[PDB]
């Protein structure tokens with residue numbers, strides 16, 4: 001029931017290297033997940 | 045279906061307006077939530093504690 005997110009923003013097809021990601025949030029939600037989508041900013 | 049109280053200051057007890065609040069807890073499924081406050085205790089050093 002915990003939805004974890006790790007993240008990192010590192011400035012520079014993906015390149016080649018190693019970088020460990022740190023916890024971002026801790027969310028006691030309870031939510032079940034089986035599918036998801038994404039959102040994009042269009043050109044208008 | 046609706047009436048209204050009155051409440052003039054010159055009422056006896058049992059007819060003056062009382063304010064009522066009720067608290068109700070429920071622990072559905074959360075792993076941990078709002079708990080009581082924590083009583084600290086300072087912190088000493090260089091001692092077996």
Ligand SMILES: *[C@@H]1O[C@H](CO)[C@@H](O)[C@H](O)[C@H]1NC(C)=O
Pocket residue numbers: 001030031032
């Ligand atoms: C998530 O779905 C499962 C069945 O796939 C169910 O048994 C479980 O109770 C659900 N979890 C929550 C938090 O609702």
